C-alpha cells in the first residue's frame, strides 16, 4: 500500500545501510550530503513508480478503448491490448500529439527506473573503486592520531610524576596525488548531468497537452483489414498519464532543488573549512602545522571525510573539548589534558 | 513491483554476497571488474524479464485473437490459448514473418534466462574449482608477509635497543604453473562468447518488422476441421513483443559496452602492473626482487588478486604509507618503520 | 516469477548448504563433482516445472474444449474440467495418439518431480548412512596429520636449538574394507540408471507428434448419454504440451551431458591420482610410504575425499608449499620447515 | 508450486530437525531407520495432498454439474455447490457406486491428513515420554566411558613415565527393566497397524471403477421440489478423483515397501549386533565383559542407540581405530593407546 511504500523508501534505511563487513566498522565512507542526494535521487523515482500504480489510486487496467456495444468483453480486451502494444507501431495509431507521447506514457516507469539506476551507478562505482582505499587511509590516520595522543598524555604524566610526524607527512604526500578527488568530482558531475537530463525529460513530459494520452487505434492489419463489422478505428485513452505528469513535476521540483546541492558538493575546496586537525596542534608530540587548504587535491577530500567521521575518535573529542574550554582561557591546555585521563 | 525488482537486482547485494563460510574471511576470491561483469550479465536479463511482465506495464494476457462476436468468452479463451500453444505447430498458423519469430516472442523470457544461466556458469565453475586453491595460497602469502614484517620490525627494535625467502620462492614456483590462469582465461573467453551470441540473438530479435507478433491462427484440426460456424482463421497478436524488443535492444547495448571489459580482463598481463610487492622490497628481512611481470602464467593472476585484496593487510598498509612518505624523502625508511610500531 | 525461480534454483545455495550441525564443521562430506551432478539432476526438473506454469508463459487454464456458443461459461468450464479428468477414463475420449500421451501431458510435472526425488534419494542415503562414518574417520586422519606435523616441527626446533605410524596403519586397514566404496558405487549406479530412464522418458515425450495434446472428448455418460442438445463430442487441446516438450528436450540434453560425468565418478580408481599423502613423506616423523592406489576399495575413496577437503589443513598447506619450492631445489626441506614456524 | 512443495517436504529438514534445546546436544534420540520411516509416512500423504490441488494440475473447482444453458452462472454455482454438500445427503444423489465413493472423493485430503497425524502420533509419544530418560541415561554412559578412557590413558602414561565398573553395572541393571523396549515395540506396532490400515483404504480407493466420481444430483428438496423449470436431476462429476487415485496407489506402494522396514525395526534383538562395547574391552580400567545380546529388554535398545550415536565420542573413535589397526597385529594395543594421546 501507499503507507508500506513510504515506510520502505523514506522512513526506513533505504540505501542508508552501513557497509555489511568488518572492514568498515563505524566508517560512513560517504559524506552525509552525498548520501542524502543519492538516496533522494534514487528512491524518489521508485517511490513515484510505486505510487502511480497503487491499488487505491489505480482504477484498473492501464488503457481502455471503448469498443462498440456489440463487441464481447474478450473482443474489447483484444482491442485494448492490441492498442497498448501498437502505441509503438506507428501506422496502427493516428494521434495529434504523435507517437512519442504514447511511447513516454507507456514507458514512464521504465524511464524513471532508468534514471534511478543511472543516478545509483556513480555512487556504486565510488563504493567499489575509491571507498576501500580512502577507508584504509582514514583508518591509518585515526590509528596514528590515537597513538600520538596516547604518547603525549603518557609523556605529560611522566613529566608530572622516534617522535616523527608520520601522519602529517602522509597528508602532505596526499596533497599531491589527486586521483581520488578526480574520481569524486567525475561522479558528482555525472550525477548532476543525469539529474539535469531527468529534469529536461520530466519537463517535456509535464508540458504535454494532457490529451496526448488519447490516441486513435486501428485494428485493421491482416485478415481484419477489410472486415466490415469492425469499426475503422477506436477511441483509446492511456490511463494514469495525469498521475505520471503530477509525479514527474514533483520529481522535477525535487531534482531542481537538489542540483544546487550537487554543485556545492562539486565545489569541494570551499567545503574544506573548519580545520579538524587544528585541534591536535596543541599536543607537544604533534607538529604545529595544518597545511591543508586551497587545493583541488585529495587532501581536501580527506579533510572533509575526517570532519564527517572523526566524532567517533575519543582523542579528537577530548582535544575538541579542551579547545572549547580554552575559549575562556581560565585553565591551561596541558593541565586539562593531564586531568582528563582519556587514553582509552 | 518495478521498484521491488530494482531494489532486488541493482540496489541490493545480488551476486555480491561474500562467501558464507569461515574459509574465506574478508577474501573476495573474485576481481572487482569480473564481479561487476558477471552481476550485470546475469541480473540484467532477469531484470528485463521481470519488468516485461510487471503488473503495470502488462495489460493482461499474453495473446488475444479477436474471435467473432458470436463466440462466448470461453470460446474466445479457447481460441487465444490454442493459438498460443499452436505458435509451435507450424500448420496451424500462417504468418508472413514465419514461425521462428513467434517461437522467439513466446519464449523470450526463457532465452534471457538461458543467457543468464550460461553467463553465471563460468563464474560458478571458477568459484567451485579454482577459488579454494587460490584462496589458500593467498592466505599463505598474507601470513608469510605479516610474519616477515613482524620479524623485521622486531629486528629493528632489537638493533635500536632461517631468514629464507619462502614467499618469494613460492611465487617463483607459481611463475611456471599456469593451470589457474588457463582456467581464468577459458572462463572469460566462454563468457565473451556467450555475450556475443546473446548480442546476435538480441539484434535479430530487435531487427524484426514488429508486425511478426501478429499471426493468422486456424482452429481447424480434428472435428472442427469441417465445422462451418467457426471462421477459417483468426487474427492473433502476441502482446509484449514490443516491450521484449525494447528490453532486448537495451540488453544488447549493455552487452556490447561490456564486451570490451571482458577482452580487457582476458588480457591479464597488461593488467598486471603497479607492483604490490615493490613496497615490501625495503624490508631488510625481505629479498629485493619482485620478478613478477610479462607472463601468461598464474603469477600475474596472483599479482592481480593481491592488488585487489591486499588493502586488508596492516603490514602492507604501513609499508605503502612509508613508501608514500619516501616520495618527499625527508625521513628514513627504517626510522619510519621503527616509529610506526604497527606489528598488530 | 521466472527470475525468482532462477535465483532460488541456480543462483542460490540450492542443495549446496553445508551440514547444519557442529559434527561436520568445514567438511564437505560430498565430492564437488557429485554435488554438482545431484544439484543439476534435482533442481533442473524442478526449475522446468516452475517455468512451464510461470505467470507469463502460461496463458491460463491447462485445457480448453471449445464448447458450442449456446453453452454458458459454466457449461464450458464443466466440459473442460470433465475432459481434464477424463483423459484417464479411456472410453470418454478418442484420440489418434492414444491415451498414454494424454496421461503424460497431464502428469508431466509429477513425472519430473518423481525423477528429481529419485535422483535426490541416493545422495540422501549417502548422507544419512555413510557420511558420518567417513566424516569421523577423516577428522581422525586430519587430527593425526596435524599432531605428527607439530611433533616433527618441535623435534626439528629442539635439534636446531611412540613415533608409531598410526594414521598409515589406519589407511592400510581401510585398504581391505570396501563397504563404503560399494555404497558409493551403488548410489552412483542408481543415479545413472535413473538418469537414463529419465532420458528415455523425455525422448519419448519429445518424439510425440505434437498433435497428441488435441483429443476428442465426450460428455455422454450417465443422464447426458442420450441428451440431444449436447454435441456428441468436443475438441479439447492440452495446453503447455509444447512447453513441456521443449523443457523435456532441454532436460534430456542436460542429462545426456551429465551421464558421462556419472560414469567418470563411478570409475573411482582412475580419479584416484595426485597423491595427497605424497607431500607428507618428507617429514622425519612420518613413514615414507603412500601405498594407496589401484584398488576398488575404500582407500581410494578416502584419498579422493582428502584431495577434496584437505586444503583447510594448515600443515598440509605448508607441506605443499615446501614441496612446490623444492621444485627449484635451491633450499632444503627441513630448513624450510623450521623457517616456516607454522605449528598453528 | 510443485517445486516449492518438494523443497519443503523432501529436500528440506522436514521432521529431521534436531531437538531445539540444550538438553539434547548432538543426540539423535531416534534411530535413523525410524526417523526415515516416520518422515516418509508423514510427509508423503501431505505431499500428495499438496500436489493434488496444485495450481497447475488443478483445472479449477472441485466439481461441475452441467446445469442447463438457461441457467445463469450463479444458478450453476448453486447447483455445483449444493451437490458438493449433498454428496453426504444420501437422498439428494443417486449414484451406481453408492455414496461412500463420493464421501471418499470429497474427503480424501482429510483422510490422508488423518493417516499422517496417526503415524506422527507414536513418534511424538516416544519423544515426549521415553526420549528424555534414554537421553539422560546415554549421556551418563558417554560420560562414564570418557572418564574411564581418560583414567586408563593417564594410568598408562604414569606407568610409562575405585576402579569400579559403574557403567557395566548400570547396563546389567538395565538388562532386567523393559519398559523402554515395551514402549518402543508398542509404538512401532501401532505405526505398522496404521500403515496397514492406510494401505487397505488406499487399495479400496484405487480399486474403484473411476466412474464413481460421476453422480446424479437432485436439487428438489424444499420449495424447489415441485418446480418445473428446474430439471429433475443433474450430471455432476467429482474432479481430481483420478489424481487422488494415482496418488493413493503411489502412497500404497510406498507404504507396502515401508512395512517390511517397520517389522525389521520391531525385531530389535536381530538388529542388536556389532557390539559397540566390544571395542572398550581392551582398556585395563574397563572390565572385559559385554553381556548384551539375545534379550527383549531395554539393553538391546540401548545398544542400538549407542551404535547410532556413538561416533561423536572421541574415546570410542580412538578405540575403534586401535582395534582396526589390531587387525594387522603389527603393533600393540597399549602402545597405540599411549601414542595416540587423545584424552580430549
Ligand atoms: C530515456 C528517455 C528517452 C526520451 C527521448 C527519446 C528520443 C526519441 C527521438 C526519436 C523520435 C522519433 O523517432 O519520432 C517519433 C517516434 O519515436 C519513436 O518511435 C521512438 C521513441 C523513443 C523511445 C521511448 C521509450 C524509452 C524506453 C526507456 C526504457 C528504459 C528501461 C531501462 C531498464 C515520432 O513521433 P513524434 O511525436 O516525435 O513525431 C510524430 C510527428 N512527426
Ligand atoms: C537460444 C536461442 C535460439 C535461437 C535460434 C534457434 C535456431 C532455429 C533454427 C531452426 C529454424 C527452423 O527450423 O525454421 C523455422 C522453424 O523453427 C522452429 O520451429 C524452431 C524454433 C527454434 C527454437 C526456439 C525456442 C527456444 C527456447 C529456449 C528455451 C531455453 C530455456 C532454458 C531453461 C521456420 O520458420 P522461419 O521463420 O525460420 O522460416 C519459415 C519460412 N521458411
Ligand atoms: C514414470 C513414467 C511412466 C511412463 C511409462 C508408463 C507405462 C505405461 C504402460 C501402460 C500403457 C497402457 O496401459 O496403455 C495405454 C493406457 O495407459 C494408461 O492408462 C496408463 C498410463 C501410465 C501412467 C502415467 C502417469 C504417471 C504418473 C506419475 C506420478 C508420479 C508422482 C510421484 C510423486 C493405452 O494408450 P496407448 O497410447 O499406450 O495405446 C492406445 C492404443 N492401443
Ligand atoms: C478413515 C477412513 C474411513 C473409511 C471407512 C469408513 C467406513 C464407512 C462405513 C459405513 C458405510 C455406510 O454407512 O454406508 C454408505 C454410507 O456411508 C456413509 O454415509 C459414511 C461414510 C464414512 C465417512 C467417510 C468420511 C471420512 C472423513 C475423515 C475425516 C478425517 C479428518 C481428521 C482431521 C452407503 O453407501 P455404500 O456405497 O457403502 O452403499 C450404498 C448402497 N448400499
Ligand atoms: C534523457 C534525455 C536523453 C532526454 C532528452 C530530451 C527528450 C526528453 C526530448 C525533449 C525535446 C524532444 C524533441 C522535441 C522536438 C522534436 C522534433 C520532432 O520532429 C522529432 C523529435 C524531437 C527532436 C524531440 C526528441 C526528444 C526530445 C529531445
Ligand atoms: C533543469 C531545468 C532547466 C529544467 C526546466 C524544464 C525545461 C527545460 C522545460 C520546461 C518546458 C519545456 C518545453 C515545453 C515545450 C516544448 C515544445 C517542444 O516542441 C520542444 C520542447 C519544448 C521547447 C520544451 C523544452 C524543455 C522545457 C523548456
Ligand atoms: C544463441 C545463438 C545460438 C543464436 C544464433 C543466431 C540466431 C538468433 C538466428 C540469427 C539469424 C538466424 C538465421 C537467419 C536466416 C535463416 C534462413 C531460414 O531459411 C532458416 C533459418 C535461418 C538459418 C535463421 C536461423 C536462426 C539464426 C541463426
Ligand atoms: C556483437 C555485435 C556484433 C552485435 C550487433 C548486432 C548484429 C550482429 C545484428 C544487427 C542486425 C542483424 C541483422 C538483421 C537482419 C537480418 C536479415 C535476416 O534474414 C538474416 C539475419 C540478419 C542479416 C541479421 C544478422 C545480425 C545483425 C547484423
Ligand atoms: C521411467 C521409465 C519407467 C520409462 C519407460 C519408458 C516409457 C516412457 C515408454 C517408452 C516407450 C513406451 C512403449 C512404446 C510402445 C508401446 C506399445 C503399446 O501397444 C503399449 C504401450 C507401449 C508398451 C509403451 C509403454 C511405455 C514406454 C515403455
Ligand atoms: C540416453 C539416450 C540413449 C536417450 C536418447 C533418446 C532415445 C532413447 C529416444 C529418442 C527417440 C525415441 C523413439 C521415438 C519413437 C518411438 C516409437 C514408439 O512406437 C516406440 C518408442 C520409440 C522407438 C522411441 C524410443 C526411445 C527413443 C529412441
Ligand atoms: C482406515 C480403516 C478404518 C479403513 C477400513 C476399510 C475401508 C476403507 C473399507 C474397505 C472395504 C469397505 C467395506 C466394503 C463393503 C461393504 C458392504 C456395504 O454393504 C457396506 C459398506 C462395507 C461394509 C464397506 C465399509 C468400508 C470398508 C471396510
Ligand atoms: C497391505 C496390503 C495387503 C494391501 C493390499 C491392498 C488390498 C488389501 C486391496 C486391493 C484390492 C482390494 C479389494 C478391491 C475390491 C473389493 C470389492 C469390495 O466390494 C469389497 C472390498 C474389496 C474386496 C477390496 C479389499 C481390499 C483389496 C484386496
Ligand atoms: C481484403 O479485401 C481487399 C479488397 O480490396 C483486398 O485487397 C485484400 O487483399 C483483402 N485482404 C485479405 C487478407 O484477403
Ligand atoms: C469433415 O468433413 C469433410 C468433408 O469433406 C470430411 O472429409 C472429413 O473427414 C470430416 N471430418 C471428420 C472429423 O469427420
Ligand atoms: C437414454 O435413452 C436411451 C434410448 O435408447 C436409453 O437406452 C437409455 O437408457 C437412456 N438413459 C437413461 C439414463 O435413462
Ligand atoms: C409442491 O407441489 C406438490 C404437488 O403435489 C405438493 O404436494 C407439495 O406440497 C408442494 N410443495 C410445497 C413446498 O408447497
Curated annotation (Swiss-Prot), chains A, B, C, D:
Record-annotated disulphide pairs: 65-236, 83-217
Documented effect of changing residue 74 to E: Loss of voltage-dependence and anion selectivity. Strong increase in permeability of sodium over chloride
Compartments where found: Cell membrane; Endoplasmic reticulum membrane
Catalysed reactions, as listed in the record: chloride(in) = chloride(out); iodide(out) = iodide(in); ATP(in) = ATP(out); K(+)(in) = K(+)(out)
S-nitrosocysteine: modified positions: 39, 318
Tissue-specific expression: Widely expressed. Highest expression is observed in oocytes and brain. Detected at very low levels in sperm cells.
Pfam families: Innexin
Entry keywords, A to Z: Calcium, Calcium channel, Calcium transport, Cell membrane, Differentiation, Disease variant, Disulfide bond, Endoplasmic reticulum, Glycoprotein, Ion channel, Ion transport, Membrane, Oogenesis, Phosphoprotein, S-nitrosylation, Transmembrane, Transmembrane helix, Transport
Stated family: Belongs to the pannexin family.
Protein name as catalogued: Pannexin-1
Organism expressing this protein natively: Homo sapiens
